[PDB]
């Protein structure tokens, strides 16, 4: 079902059909290989979402009860004092199934977080208490985003592969099969005419020899 050829290129279409079938067979399983991890990470993210939504509030409460033990504002000094970063991130690579995945590594740098904000004499110790709670919470929160990134990438890849498999299955194989059938019919069409020509020649020859021999009897 294309621009119909009629030559002896039947073998070419046959090889193309094997190639398409092989590609379909391989991709139909490469899809499921990634679908497994998609199913896994979906639950891994969903279950932990609410757990984190609650533990973060727990840590926020832990610091809130600390913020007024010294009986004074801490935020105004905090938002200016912070000038060094420790809980930054790094791009970690992990080809799960031959697919790139830039994951996040919690680049923890526990040597400094904010300089000269303790020891004033009323609240230095108190802030040192709930701070590590956030130090742990942020590291825990890094992994949720690390999983969301993989979720999005995996969704994209599975979508494209499944789309390609459907296209190949539905609008490639039948076209080639129709082409093969057409060429197969054409070959027999030519064979019939060749046979008929030879038959006519044989008829002429036998009639001529019958005439000659029936004449030579006398």
């Amino acid at each position: 079902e294309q621009v119909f050829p009629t030559r002896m290129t039947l073998g070419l279409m046959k090889t193309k059909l094997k190639g398409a079938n092989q590609g379909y067979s391989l991709l139909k399983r490469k899809s499921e290989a990634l679908t497994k991890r998609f199913r896994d990470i979906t639950k891994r993210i969903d279950d932990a979402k609410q757990k984190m939504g609650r533990v973060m509030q727990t840590a926020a409460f832990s610091l809130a009860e600390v913020s007024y033990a010294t009986g004074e504002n801490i935020g105004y000094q905090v938002q200016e004092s912070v000038s060094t970063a420790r809980f930054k991130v790094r791009a970690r690579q992990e080809n799960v199934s031959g697919v790139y995945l830039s994951q996040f590594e919690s680049y923890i740098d526990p040597e400094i977080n904010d300089f000269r904000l303790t020891g004033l004499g009323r609240g230095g110790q108190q802030v040192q208490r709930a701070k590590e709670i956030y130090s742990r919470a942020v590291e825990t929160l890094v992994e949720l985003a690390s999983l969301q990134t993989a979720f999005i990438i995996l969704d994209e890849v599975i979508k494209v592969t499944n789309r390609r498999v459907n296209a190949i299955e539905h609008v490639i194989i039948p076209r080639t099969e129709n082409t093969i059938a057409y060429i197969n019919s054409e070959l027999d069409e030519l064979d019939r005419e060749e046979f008929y020509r030879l038959k006519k020649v044989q008829e002429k020859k036998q009639n001529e020899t019958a005439k000659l021999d029936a004449e030579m009897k006398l």
Partner: protein, 115 residues
């Protein structure tokens, strides 16, 4: 990209102070830009949230992860839903003064289909 190092925060002070206390942020004097846009309840409008979201996502290559309160995202909820890219790793952080619901997430919206 390896520039995905800095962390973005658009949240109330009660959380921002503690986050900076943990050492996540700093001051960037090269632009005099903090790693966050502080939030004031009943004093900050919604256009500021959208502008800072766009600035952090499509104008700053430094941000790798963005933390935004549920109520703040509510002001740009449509903007957050419309934008879906892997680079910024947008995350609707739980918000202080509000018991966060782990079901308002724009990211989780796609999780809510095809279980």
């Amino acid at each position: 990209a390896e520039k995905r190092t800095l962390i973005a925060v658009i949240a109330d002070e009660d959380t921002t102070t503690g986050l900076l206390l943990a050492g996540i942020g700093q001051i960037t004097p090269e632009t005099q830009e903090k790693n966050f846009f502080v939030y004031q309840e009943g004093k900050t409008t919604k256009e500021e949230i959208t502008d800072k979201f766009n600035h952090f996502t499509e104008e700053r290559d430094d941000i790798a992860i963005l933390l935004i309160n549920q109520h703040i995202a509510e002001n740009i909820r449509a903007r957050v839903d419309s934008f879906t890219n892997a680079f910024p790793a947008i995350l609707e952080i739980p918000s202080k003064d509000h018991p966060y619901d782990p079901e308002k997430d724009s990211v989780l919206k796609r999780v809510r289909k095809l279980f």
